């Protein structure tokens, strides 16, 4: 009975939210927790 699983948090934190919004090339990667989140090293980076 767990086909629907609600999300408790967004993939970004509240401190990282505007940076994700303002970076069109920002993407999530597998995180420790094992979920998909945005990492500060992948936002507004040259790679």
């Amino acid at each position: 009975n767990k086909l629907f699983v609600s999300k408790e948090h967004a993939p970004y934190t509240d401190e990282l939210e505007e940076d994700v919004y303002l970076d069109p090339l920002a993407r999530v990667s597998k995180d420790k927790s094992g979920s998909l989140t945005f990492n500060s090293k992948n936002i507004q980076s040259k790679d």
Binding site: L3, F4, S6, K7, P11, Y21, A26, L36
Partner: protein, 97 residues
């Protein structure tokens, strides 16, 4: 109606092989996942709550008004599963919705 929408959205993502909607953000920006679904009349049960049950002074939740909006189903989908900041355009087309 929101429960039917949530279950259908989850099952449609499963039918697409996407078990975690956040996997979409490994390919696209959060601003690139849209929701363009709608209804002809929306949450008619909340309409009953605010137009008849409140008239009879029966207990109705204080935010019943928001549950009636036709875009509230899409809002709940985004707030529970998708978490995108992409386009949201809710059509209202009666039976051609």
């Amino acid at each position: 109606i929101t429960l039917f929408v949530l279950v259908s959205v989850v099952e449609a993502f499963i039918a697409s092989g996407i078990t975690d909607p956040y996997e979409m953000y490994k390919y696209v920006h959060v601003s690139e996942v849209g929701n363009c679904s709608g209804s002809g009349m929306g949450g008619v049960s909340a309409l009953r709550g605010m137009f008849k049950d409140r008239f009879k002074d029966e207990p109705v939740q204080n935010d019943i008004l928001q549950e009636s909006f036709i875009n509230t189903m899409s809002a709940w989908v985004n707030m529970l599963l998708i978490s995108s900041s992409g386009p949201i355009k809710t059509p209202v087309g009666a039976c051609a919705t």
